[PDB]
Every structure is written in structure tokens, then in C-alpha cells.
Amino acid sequence: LGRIWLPVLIVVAVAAGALIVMNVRTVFGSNPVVVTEKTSDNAEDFNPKVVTYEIFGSGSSAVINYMD
Amino acid sequence: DPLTEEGTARMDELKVAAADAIKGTPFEGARIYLGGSAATYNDMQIGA
């Protein structure tokens, strides 16, 4: 391999250098924005508790104030 | 001095702190952008 050893080793070295270049070149940057995760709850109406107000008396009418 | 090795190391801490402050609030899903001299030189050091 007197006339084969040189070009093969040259190609091997060039491939190694290209691989190193490709790997490290992309590491820079790659983190421009930060996006926080979202964890919401299911907004549904199943078995809602029911509150009832009742006003009654011997009078005809009344004035009523209440808290919703 | 913000333009030192100590100054540029605070950039990740700020982003972590803001992301943790947002956690659990209606602000979830927000986007955080950090800029300035110290951030610029942090990026410069990584690139170098």
C-alpha cells in the first residue's frame, strides 16, 4: 500500500475534521426563547351545589338584599 | 461590575427565577426574553 496509504489517511482526517466542525458549530445559540408549561384544570359543571333563598310572610311585599 | 465572569453567570438564574415565578399562575405559557450587555457577553463567551 505504498501509494494507497497517503490518500486514504488524508480522506480519513478530512472526514474527522468535518465531523468535528459539524458537531460543534450547531451548539452555539439554540436557546433564544423560554416557553413556560401550561397546567389548567377542567372547567366543567357536574353536580354543582344548589343554594335556595326563600322569603315568605304575612305581608304583601318585601325588600330583599342577598349575597350571590 | 456586571461585565465580569460573575455577572454573565447570573443570566440563567434570572430566567429560572422568572419561569418559577410564572409557575402555577394565569401567566403560564408566557414567553421570556432576556437581553442586555451581560447576556450579550455570555453568548460571546460561549461562542468563543
φ/ψ of B32, rounded to 5, equals -110, 125
Contacts of B29 in chain A (CB under 8 A): 35-38
Contacts of B13 in chain A (CB under 8 A): none
Could you give the C-alpha distances from A20 to A49, B37, B48, in angstroms and in order? 66, 31, 16
CB count in 10 Å sphere of residue B15: 16
By residue count, chain A amounts to 68
Secondary structure E strands in chain B: 31-32
Is-contact B22 A36, C-beta < 8 A?
A: yes
* CA–CA distance, A47 with A55 (Å, rounded to integer): 26
Q: Which three cell numbers stand for residue A45?
A: 359543571
Residue written as grid cell 432576556 = B34
Is-contact A31 B18, C-beta < 8 A?
A: no
User: A3: Cβ–Cβ under 8 A, 6 or more apart, which residues?
Assistant: none
